[PDB]
Write a protein that binds this ligand. Structure first.
Ligand SMILES: CCCc1cc(=O)n2nc(NCc3ccc(-c4ccccc4)cc3)nc2[nH]1
Ligand SMILES: [Zn+2]
Length: 352
């Protein structure tokens, strides 16, 4: 049916809307960090990616785990695509006022992420002690810093570069929303800046393109009809589908944390699948609140087709396959397929 999914969705909203001092603990820590990074040569133009929002939650099950982004406006950037990866880039500068605020991190002509991250970490490490806050150092690149307030509160900090120039060539054929959100909206969205986060593909001074802000924007204005979800008549189940798929992967990832099979999968994989189903189903009538279950099943069916065909194109970079053999091995994909197919056929036990 579509009854139980609603109760999952009610439990999820009640935790989310519940009164907690958590966001206030987070707010004080980040405002203090931002004030200390600003009175420093390299990070004087630092700020929160989305102001007003400190309470950003990636894990839809964990109301105690926060994720924050620190954007840095980098003017006159030159990017070089690393090893034809389409999403991984070197950072160079057009060079006009040569003694630019980030010249101190230049390793030759290429901008060192590691050098920039070390200073960012060193500035934060020295401000935590000054404050109940403690930091942990975790590999990968970004999140750079991870903070722990009290016992349950956890905060991931990601350093990002902001570029107000045109999106790289690898995105040219991406964001295929023309028949859903319109060609007018695509051009507007693509006029918006883009972010680079420190990341590699297994170790160089590379940066991955990030479009968190586009995702947030589309989600808060997701209909073909401009009035979608504003009234009683136009209530769609798009966000509810996204939430249920996110919960599904989070529940399976917890259920199988002892084994390492679902370690490569994340919300990126679940978000990208949903957005591809949004393109496939552009009409609001295809997302009626009465069809929750049928709608959710088409999301689960598409994701299942992606795992099996080993194909999940990045929504912005269509040549980047999230499900490639070098990214995720067949063994890990087949383990996930079987786990979901059992969930589909047993009235999703994880959701109770
Ligand atoms: C709306 C669709 C979801 C979405 C949100 C967002 O914020 N972004 N930002 C990018 N940028 C390129 C990019 C390329 C690859 C990976 C990746 C992920 C996992 C494993 C291995 C690689 C992550 C980012 N794509 C997205 N898609
Ligand atoms: Zn809607």
């Amino acid at each position: 049916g579509a009854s139980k999914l609603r109760a999952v969705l009610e439990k999820l909203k009640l935790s989310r809307d519940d009164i907690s001092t958590a966001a206030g603990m987070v707010k004080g820590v980040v405002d203090h960090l931002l004030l200390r990074l600003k009175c420093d040569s390299a990070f004087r133009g630092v700020g929160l990616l989305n102001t007003g929002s400190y309470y950003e939650h990636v894990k839809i099950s964990a109301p105690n785990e926060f994720d924050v982004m620190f954007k840095l406006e980098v003017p006159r950037i030159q990017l070089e695509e690393y090893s034809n990866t389409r999403a991984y880039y070197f950072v160079k500068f057009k060079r006009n006022p040569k003694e630019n605020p980030l010249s101190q991190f230049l390793e030759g002509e290429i901008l060192s992420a590691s050098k920039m991250l070390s200073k960012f970490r060193k500035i934060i490490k020295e401000e935590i002690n000054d404050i109940d806050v403690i930091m942990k150092r975790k590999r990968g690149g970004s999140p750079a810093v991870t903070l722990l307030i009290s016992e349950k509160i956890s905060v991931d900090i990601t350093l990002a570069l902001e570029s107000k120039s045109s999106w790289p060539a690898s995105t040219q054929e991406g964001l295929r929303i023309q028949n859903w959100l319109s060609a007018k909206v695509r051009k507007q969205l693509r006029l918006k800046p883009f972010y680079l986060v420190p990341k590699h593909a297994k170790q160089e001074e590379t940066w991955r393109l990030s479009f968190s802000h586009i995702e947030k924007e589309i989600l808060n204005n997701h209909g073909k009809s401009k009035t979608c979800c504003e009234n009683k008549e136009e209530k769609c189940c798009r966000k509810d589908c996204l939430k249920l798929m996110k919960y599904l992967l989070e529940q399976l990832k917890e259920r199988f944390k002892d084994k390492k099979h679902l370690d490569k999968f994340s919300s990126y994989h679940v978000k990208t699948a949903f957005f591809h189903v949004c393109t496939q189903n552009p009409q609001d009538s295809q997302w009626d609140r009465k069809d929750l279950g049928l709608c959710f099943d088409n999301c689960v069916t598409y994701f299942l087709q992606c795992l099996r065909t080993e194909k999940l194109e990045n929504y912005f970079i269509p040549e980047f396959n999230l499900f490639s053999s070098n990214l995720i091995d067949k063994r890990s994909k087949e383990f996930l397929t079987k786990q979901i197919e059992y969930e589909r056929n047993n009235e999703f036990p994880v959701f109770d």
